[PDB]
Each structure stands twice: as C-alpha cells, then as structure tokens.
Amino acid sequence: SDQSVYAMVFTLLCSLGIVLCLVTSVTVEW
C-alpha cells in the first residue's frame, strides 16, 4: 500500500499470536 485499518488488523493478529504462544508453551510442559 486506509493505513489505520492495516494497523488495527495487525495489532489484532499480533495479540492473538501472543495468546496462542502462551497456550502452546503451557500445554507442552503440562
């Protein structure tokens, strides 16, 4: 490439990735 929409979707995908990193890291050690 509105850039605000791109920043919004990027923040949402990054936050979901952080949560999924937490779930993977907990489940393997469990």
Side-chain angles (χ1 to χ4, degrees):
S1 61
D2 195 13
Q3 303 282 340
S4 54
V5 184
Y6 287 102
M8 168 198 304
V9 177
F10 196 69
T11 49
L12 291 184
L13 287 181
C14 288
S15 309
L16 187 60
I18 290 178
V19 178
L20 261 308
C21 287
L22 171 66
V23 180
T24 50
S25 66
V26 170
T27 44
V28 173
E29 298 299 316
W30 199 296

PDB file of all heavy atoms in Angstrom:
ATOM      1  N   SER A   1       0.827  -1.199   0.000  1.00  0.00           N
ATOM      2  CA  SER A   1       0.000   0.000   0.000  1.00  0.00           C
ATOM      3  C   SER A   1       0.866   1.255   0.000  1.00  0.00           C
ATOM      4  O   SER A   1       1.872   1.324   0.706  1.00  0.00           O
ATOM      5  CB  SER A   1      -0.936   0.006   1.210  1.00  0.00           C
ATOM      6  OG  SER A   1      -0.200  -0.006   2.421  1.00  0.00           O
ATOM      7  N   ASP A   2      -7.160   2.429   3.883  1.00  0.00           N
ATOM      8  CA  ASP A   2      -6.577   3.321   4.877  1.00  0.00           C
ATOM      9  C   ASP A   2      -5.595   2.564   5.767  1.00  0.00           C
ATOM     10  O   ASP A   2      -5.842   1.416   6.134  1.00  0.00           O
ATOM     11  CB  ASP A   2      -7.674   3.970   5.726  1.00  0.00           C
ATOM     12  CG  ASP A   2      -7.172   5.161   6.519  1.00  0.00           C
ATOM     13  OD1 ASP A   2      -6.055   5.642   6.237  1.00  0.00           O
ATOM     14  OD2 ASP A   2      -7.899   5.617   7.426  1.00  0.00           O
ATOM     15  N   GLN A   3      -4.486   3.226   6.117  1.00  0.00           N
ATOM     16  CA  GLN A   3      -3.423   2.598   6.899  1.00  0.00           C
ATOM     17  C   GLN A   3      -3.841   2.297   8.335  1.00  0.00           C
ATOM     18  O   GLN A   3      -3.245   1.414   8.969  1.00  0.00           O
ATOM     19  CB  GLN A   3      -2.184   3.496   6.899  1.00  0.00           C
ATOM     20  CG  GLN A   3      -1.648   3.823   5.513  1.00  0.00           C
ATOM     21  CD  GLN A   3      -0.849   2.685   4.913  1.00  0.00           C
ATOM     22  OE1 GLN A   3      -0.376   1.804   5.628  1.00  0.00           O
ATOM     23  NE2 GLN A   3      -0.691   2.698   3.594  1.00  0.00           N
ATOM     24  N   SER A   4      -4.844   3.013   8.854  1.00  0.00           N
ATOM     25  CA  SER A   4      -5.346   2.756  10.201  1.00  0.00           C
ATOM     26  C   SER A   4      -5.982   1.375  10.302  1.00  0.00           C
ATOM     27  O   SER A   4      -5.832   0.687  11.320  1.00  0.00           O
ATOM     28  CB  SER A   4      -6.351   3.841  10.596  1.00  0.00           C
ATOM     29  OG  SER A   4      -7.381   3.956   9.628  1.00  0.00           O
ATOM     30  N   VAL A   5      -6.687   0.952   9.247  1.00  0.00           N
ATOM     31  CA  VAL A   5      -7.280  -0.383   9.202  1.00  0.00           C
ATOM     32  C   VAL A   5      -6.194  -1.453   9.198  1.00  0.00           C
ATOM     33  O   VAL A   5      -6.316  -2.486   9.875  1.00  0.00           O
ATOM     34  CB  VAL A   5      -8.205  -0.503   7.975  1.00  0.00           C
ATOM     35  CG1 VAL A   5      -8.906  -1.854   7.950  1.00  0.00           C
ATOM     36  CG2 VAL A   5      -9.220   0.631   7.967  1.00  0.00           C
ATOM     37  N   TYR A   6      -5.113  -1.216   8.442  1.00  0.00           N
ATOM     38  CA  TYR A   6      -3.980  -2.137   8.415  1.00  0.00           C
ATOM     39  C   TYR A   6      -3.332  -2.263   9.787  1.00  0.00           C
ATOM     40  O   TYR A   6      -3.029  -3.379  10.235  1.00  0.00           O
ATOM     41  CB  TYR A   6      -2.943  -1.669   7.394  1.00  0.00           C
ATOM     42  CG  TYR A   6      -3.320  -1.870   5.943  1.00  0.00           C
ATOM     43  CD1 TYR A   6      -3.781  -0.810   5.170  1.00  0.00           C
ATOM     44  CD2 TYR A   6      -3.190  -3.115   5.338  1.00  0.00           C
ATOM     45  CE1 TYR A   6      -4.121  -0.987   3.839  1.00  0.00           C
ATOM     46  CE2 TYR A   6      -3.525  -3.302   4.008  1.00  0.00           C
ATOM     47  CZ  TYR A   6      -3.990  -2.235   3.264  1.00  0.00           C
ATOM     48  OH  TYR A   6      -4.324  -2.417   1.940  1.00  0.00           O
ATOM     49  N   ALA A   7      -3.145  -1.131  10.479  1.00  0.00           N
ATOM     50  CA  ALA A   7      -2.574  -1.159  11.826  1.00  0.00           C
ATOM     51  C   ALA A   7      -3.487  -1.887  12.808  1.00  0.00           C
ATOM     52  O   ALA A   7      -3.007  -2.644  13.662  1.00  0.00           O
ATOM     53  CB  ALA A   7      -2.296   0.264  12.310  1.00  0.00           C
ATOM     54  N   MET A   8      -4.806  -1.690  12.679  1.00  0.00           N
ATOM     55  CA  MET A   8      -5.774  -2.344  13.560  1.00  0.00           C
ATOM     56  C   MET A   8      -5.753  -3.863  13.395  1.00  0.00           C
ATOM     57  O   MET A   8      -5.682  -4.608  14.386  1.00  0.00           O
ATOM     58  CB  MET A   8      -7.172  -1.788  13.276  1.00  0.00           C
ATOM     59  CG  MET A   8      -8.317  -2.565  13.907  1.00  0.00           C
ATOM     60  SD  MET A   8      -9.895  -2.185  13.113  1.00  0.00           S
ATOM     61  CE  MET A   8      -9.967  -0.405  13.309  1.00  0.00           C
ATOM     62  N   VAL A   9      -5.797  -4.336  12.143  1.00  0.00           N
ATOM     63  CA  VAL A   9      -5.784  -5.776  11.878  1.00  0.00           C
ATOM     64  C   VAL A   9      -4.443  -6.388  12.285  1.00  0.00           C
ATOM     65  O   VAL A   9      -4.393  -7.509  12.817  1.00  0.00           O
ATOM     66  CB  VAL A   9      -6.131  -6.040  10.399  1.00  0.00           C
ATOM     67  CG1 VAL A   9      -6.063  -7.525  10.061  1.00  0.00           C
ATOM     68  CG2 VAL A   9      -7.525  -5.519  10.088  1.00  0.00           C
ATOM     69  N   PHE A  10      -3.345  -5.640  12.093  1.00  0.00           N
ATOM     70  CA  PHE A  10      -2.027  -6.105  12.519  1.00  0.00           C
ATOM     71  C   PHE A  10      -1.947  -6.271  14.035  1.00  0.00           C
ATOM     72  O   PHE A  10      -1.429  -7.286  14.523  1.00  0.00           O
ATOM     73  CB  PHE A  10      -0.958  -5.130  12.021  1.00  0.00           C
ATOM     74  CG  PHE A  10       0.439  -5.680  12.059  1.00  0.00           C
ATOM     75  CD1 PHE A  10       0.819  -6.705  11.204  1.00  0.00           C
ATOM     76  CD2 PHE A  10       1.378  -5.162  12.936  1.00  0.00           C
ATOM     77  CE1 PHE A  10       2.106  -7.211  11.233  1.00  0.00           C
ATOM     78  CE2 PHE A  10       2.668  -5.662  12.972  1.00  0.00           C
ATOM     79  CZ  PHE A  10       3.033  -6.689  12.119  1.00  0.00           C
ATOM     80  N   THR A  11      -2.490  -5.304  14.792  1.00  0.00           N
ATOM     81  CA  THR A  11      -2.500  -5.407  16.253  1.00  0.00           C
ATOM     82  C   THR A  11      -3.346  -6.581  16.733  1.00  0.00           C
ATOM     83  O   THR A  11      -2.952  -7.295  17.668  1.00  0.00           O
ATOM     84  CB  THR A  11      -3.016  -4.110  16.884  1.00  0.00           C
ATOM     85  OG1 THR A  11      -4.236  -3.710  16.247  1.00  0.00           O
ATOM     86  CG2 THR A  11      -1.989  -2.994  16.775  1.00  0.00           C
ATOM     87  N   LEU A  12      -4.511  -6.797  16.101  1.00  0.00           N
ATOM     88  CA  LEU A  12      -5.372  -7.913  16.495  1.00  0.00           C
ATOM     89  C   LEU A  12      -4.700  -9.261  16.241  1.00  0.00           C
ATOM     90  O   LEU A  12      -4.728 -10.154  17.107  1.00  0.00           O
ATOM     91  CB  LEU A  12      -6.709  -7.835  15.758  1.00  0.00           C
ATOM     92  CG  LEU A  12      -7.631  -6.681  16.161  1.00  0.00           C
ATOM     93  CD1 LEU A  12      -8.958  -6.777  15.426  1.00  0.00           C
ATOM     94  CD2 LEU A  12      -7.844  -6.653  17.669  1.00  0.00           C
ATOM     95  N   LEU A  13      -4.057  -9.410  15.077  1.00  0.00           N
ATOM     96  CA  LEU A  13      -3.386 -10.667  14.758  1.00  0.00           C
ATOM     97  C   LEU A  13      -2.179 -10.908  15.665  1.00  0.00           C
ATOM     98  O   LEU A  13      -1.931 -12.052  16.078  1.00  0.00           O
ATOM     99  CB  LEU A  13      -2.982 -10.680  13.284  1.00  0.00           C
ATOM    100  CG  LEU A  13      -4.113 -10.852  12.265  1.00  0.00           C
ATOM    101  CD1 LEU A  13      -3.558 -10.867  10.849  1.00  0.00           C
ATOM    102  CD2 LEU A  13      -4.911 -12.118  12.544  1.00  0.00           C
ATOM    103  N   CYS A  14      -1.444  -9.844  16.018  1.00  0.00           N
ATOM    104  CA  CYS A  14      -0.307  -9.990  16.928  1.00  0.00           C
ATOM    105  C   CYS A  14      -0.750 -10.395  18.333  1.00  0.00           C
ATOM    106  O   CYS A  14      -0.099 -11.233  18.976  1.00  0.00           O
ATOM    107  CB  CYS A  14       0.499  -8.693  16.978  1.00  0.00           C
ATOM    108  SG  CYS A  14       1.445  -8.342  15.483  1.00  0.00           S
ATOM    109  N   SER A  15      -1.856  -9.816  18.821  1.00  0.00           N
ATOM    110  CA  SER A  15      -2.361 -10.180  20.144  1.00  0.00           C
ATOM    111  C   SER A  15      -2.835 -11.631  20.185  1.00  0.00           C
ATOM    112  O   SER A  15      -2.563 -12.355  21.162  1.00  0.00           O
ATOM    113  CB  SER A  15      -3.492  -9.234  20.543  1.00  0.00           C
ATOM    114  OG  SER A  15      -3.092  -7.883  20.394  1.00  0.00           O
ATOM    115  N   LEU A  16      -3.521 -12.077  19.121  1.00  0.00           N
ATOM    116  CA  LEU A  16      -3.933 -13.478  19.031  1.00  0.00           C
ATOM    117  C   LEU A  16      -2.726 -14.414  18.978  1.00  0.00           C
ATOM    118  O   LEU A  16      -2.745 -15.499  19.580  1.00  0.00           O
ATOM    119  CB  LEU A  16      -4.828 -13.680  17.809  1.00  0.00           C
ATOM    120  CG  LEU A  16      -5.489 -15.053  17.663  1.00  0.00           C
ATOM    121  CD1 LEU A  16      -6.370 -15.353  18.865  1.00  0.00           C
ATOM    122  CD2 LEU A  16      -6.291 -15.127  16.373  1.00  0.00           C
ATOM    123  N   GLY A  17      -1.661 -13.996  18.282  1.00  0.00           N
ATOM    124  CA  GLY A  17      -0.434 -14.779  18.273  1.00  0.00           C
ATOM    125  C   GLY A  17       0.222 -14.896  19.637  1.00  0.00           C
ATOM    126  O   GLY A  17       0.744 -15.958  19.986  1.00  0.00           O
ATOM    127  N   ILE A  18       0.194 -13.814  20.424  1.00  0.00           N
ATOM    128  CA  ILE A  18       0.746 -13.845  21.783  1.00  0.00           C
ATOM    129  C   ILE A  18      -0.024 -14.829  22.664  1.00  0.00           C
ATOM    130  O   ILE A  18       0.575 -15.638  23.401  1.00  0.00           O
ATOM    131  CB  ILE A  18       0.755 -12.423  22.381  1.00  0.00           C
ATOM    132  CG1 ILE A  18       1.803 -11.555  21.682  1.00  0.00           C
ATOM    133  CG2 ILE A  18       1.010 -12.446  23.886  1.00  0.00           C
ATOM    134  CD1 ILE A  18       1.842 -10.125  22.168  1.00  0.00           C
ATOM    135  N   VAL A  19      -1.362 -14.800  22.570  1.00  0.00           N
ATOM    136  CA  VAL A  19      -2.191 -15.723  23.353  1.00  0.00           C
ATOM    137  C   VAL A  19      -1.930 -17.176  22.943  1.00  0.00           C
ATOM    138  O   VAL A  19      -1.804 -18.069  23.800  1.00  0.00           O
ATOM    139  CB  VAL A  19      -3.679 -15.345  23.224  1.00  0.00           C
ATOM    140  CG1 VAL A  19      -4.557 -16.329  23.989  1.00  0.00           C
ATOM    141  CG2 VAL A  19      -3.915 -13.936  23.744  1.00  0.00           C
ATOM    142  N   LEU A  20      -1.790 -17.427  21.634  1.00  0.00           N
ATOM    143  CA  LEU A  20      -1.514 -18.785  21.170  1.00  0.00           C
ATOM    144  C   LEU A  20      -0.122 -19.267  21.579  1.00  0.00           C
ATOM    145  O   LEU A  20       0.056 -20.466  21.849  1.00  0.00           O
ATOM    146  CB  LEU A  20      -1.686 -18.871  19.654  1.00  0.00           C
ATOM    147  CG  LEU A  20      -3.020 -19.447  19.164  1.00  0.00           C
ATOM    148  CD1 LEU A  20      -3.297 -20.792  19.824  1.00  0.00           C
ATOM    149  CD2 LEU A  20      -4.179 -18.485  19.400  1.00  0.00           C
ATOM    150  N   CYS A  21       0.859 -18.354  21.643  1.00  0.00           N
ATOM    151  CA  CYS A  21       2.180 -18.703  22.167  1.00  0.00           C
ATOM    152  C   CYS A  21       2.092 -19.157  23.617  1.00  0.00           C
ATOM    153  O   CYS A  21       2.723 -20.157  24.000  1.00  0.00           O
ATOM    154  CB  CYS A  21       3.134 -17.513  22.052  1.00  0.00           C
ATOM    155  SG  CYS A  21       3.697 -17.125  20.386  1.00  0.00           S
ATOM    156  N   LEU A  22       1.280 -18.449  24.420  1.00  0.00           N
ATOM    157  CA  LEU A  22       1.059 -18.841  25.814  1.00  0.00           C
ATOM    158  C   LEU A  22       0.448 -20.234  25.919  1.00  0.00           C
ATOM    159  O   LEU A  22       0.913 -21.062  26.719  1.00  0.00           O
ATOM    160  CB  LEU A  22       0.155 -17.821  26.512  1.00  0.00           C
ATOM    161  CG  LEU A  22      -0.350 -18.180  27.915  1.00  0.00           C
ATOM    162  CD1 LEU A  22       0.801 -18.228  28.910  1.00  0.00           C
ATOM    163  CD2 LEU A  22      -1.416 -17.197  28.371  1.00  0.00           C
ATOM    164  N   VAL A  23      -0.561 -20.520  25.086  1.00  0.00           N
ATOM    165  CA  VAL A  23      -1.245 -21.814  25.162  1.00  0.00           C
ATOM    166  C   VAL A  23      -0.311 -22.958  24.761  1.00  0.00           C
ATOM    167  O   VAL A  23      -0.265 -23.996  25.441  1.00  0.00           O
ATOM    168  CB  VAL A  23      -2.531 -21.801  24.315  1.00  0.00           C
ATOM    169  CG1 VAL A  23      -3.241 -23.148  24.397  1.00  0.00           C
ATOM    170  CG2 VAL A  23      -3.467 -20.713  24.802  1.00  0.00           C
ATOM    171  N   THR A  24       0.475 -22.772  23.687  1.00  0.00           N
ATOM    172  CA  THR A  24       1.420 -23.809  23.254  1.00  0.00           C
ATOM    173  C   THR A  24       2.484 -24.090  24.314  1.00  0.00           C
ATOM    174  O   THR A  24       2.756 -25.263  24.644  1.00  0.00           O
ATOM    175  CB  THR A  24       2.093 -23.396  21.944  1.00  0.00           C
ATOM    176  OG1 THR A  24       2.613 -22.064  22.064  1.00  0.00           O
ATOM    177  CG2 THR A  24       1.120 -23.447  20.789  1.00  0.00           C
ATOM    178  N   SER A  25       3.067 -23.017  24.878  1.00  0.00           N
ATOM    179  CA  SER A  25       4.123 -23.153  25.874  1.00  0.00           C
ATOM    180  C   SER A  25       3.623 -23.840  27.138  1.00  0.00           C
ATOM    181  O   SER A  25       4.352 -24.635  27.745  1.00  0.00           O
ATOM    182  CB  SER A  25       4.699 -21.779  26.216  1.00  0.00           C
ATOM    183  OG  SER A  25       3.733 -20.965  26.856  1.00  0.00           O
ATOM    184  N   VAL A  26       2.385 -23.550  27.553  1.00  0.00           N
ATOM    185  CA  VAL A  26       1.852 -24.211  28.741  1.00  0.00           C
ATOM    186  C   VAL A  26       1.544 -25.683  28.460  1.00  0.00           C
ATOM    187  O   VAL A  26       1.862 -26.560  29.283  1.00  0.00           O
ATOM    188  CB  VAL A  26       0.627 -23.440  29.269  1.00  0.00           C
ATOM    189  CG1 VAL A  26      -0.105 -24.230  30.345  1.00  0.00           C
ATOM    190  CG2 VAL A  26       1.073 -22.105  29.838  1.00  0.00           C
ATOM    191  N   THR A  27       0.961 -25.984  27.287  1.00  0.00           N
ATOM    192  CA  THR A  27       0.479 -27.340  27.023  1.00  0.00           C
ATOM    193  C   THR A  27       1.616 -28.346  26.877  1.00  0.00           C
ATOM    194  O   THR A  27       1.481 -29.497  27.322  1.00  0.00           O
ATOM    195  CB  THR A  27      -0.402 -27.364  25.773  1.00  0.00           C
ATOM    196  OG1 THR A  27       0.204 -26.584  24.735  1.00  0.00           O
ATOM    197  CG2 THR A  27      -1.789 -26.828  26.092  1.00  0.00           C
ATOM    198  N   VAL A  28       2.742 -27.934  26.274  1.00  0.00           N
ATOM    199  CA  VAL A  28       3.851 -28.879  26.094  1.00  0.00           C
ATOM    200  C   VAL A  28       4.449 -29.292  27.443  1.00  0.00           C
ATOM    201  O   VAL A  28       4.676 -30.487  27.702  1.00  0.00           O
ATOM    202  CB  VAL A  28       4.908 -28.287  25.143  1.00  0.00           C
ATOM    203  CG1 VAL A  28       6.135 -29.182  25.073  1.00  0.00           C
ATOM    204  CG2 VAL A  28       4.314 -28.120  23.756  1.00  0.00           C
ATOM    205  N   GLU A  29       4.648 -28.325  28.344  1.00  0.00           N
ATOM    206  CA  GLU A  29       5.204 -28.634  29.659  1.00  0.00           C
ATOM    207  C   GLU A  29       4.220 -29.419  30.521  1.00  0.00           C
ATOM    208  O   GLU A  29       4.637 -30.287  31.303  1.00  0.00           O
ATOM    209  CB  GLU A  29       5.628 -27.347  30.364  1.00  0.00           C
ATOM    210  CG  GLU A  29       6.719 -26.586  29.633  1.00  0.00           C
ATOM    211  CD  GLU A  29       7.998 -27.392  29.488  1.00  0.00           C
ATOM    212  OE1 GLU A  29       8.415 -28.028  30.478  1.00  0.00           O
ATOM    213  OE2 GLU A  29       8.587 -27.393  28.385  1.00  0.00           O
ATOM    214  N   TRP A  30       2.915 -29.131  30.389  1.00  0.00           N
ATOM    215  CA  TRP A  30       1.895 -29.899  31.106  1.00  0.00           C
ATOM    216  C   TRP A  30       1.898 -31.363  30.673  1.00  0.00           C
ATOM    217  O   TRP A  30       1.815 -32.271  31.518  1.00  0.00           O
ATOM    218  CB  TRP A  30       0.521 -29.267  30.866  1.00  0.00           C
ATOM    219  CG  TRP A  30      -0.548 -29.647  31.854  1.00  0.00           C
ATOM    220  CD1 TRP A  30      -1.064 -30.892  32.069  1.00  0.00           C
ATOM    221  CD2 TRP A  30      -1.256 -28.764  32.736  1.00  0.00           C
ATOM    222  NE1 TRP A  30      -2.032 -30.843  33.041  1.00  0.00           N
ATOM    223  CE2 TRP A  30      -2.171 -29.549  33.465  1.00  0.00           C
ATOM    224  CE3 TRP A  30      -1.199 -27.387  32.985  1.00  0.00           C
ATOM    225  CZ2 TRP A  30      -3.023 -29.006  34.426  1.00  0.00           C
ATOM    226  CZ3 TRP A  30      -2.048 -26.850  33.941  1.00  0.00           C
ATOM    227  CH2 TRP A  30      -2.946 -27.658  34.649  1.00  0.00           C
TER     228      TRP A  30
END
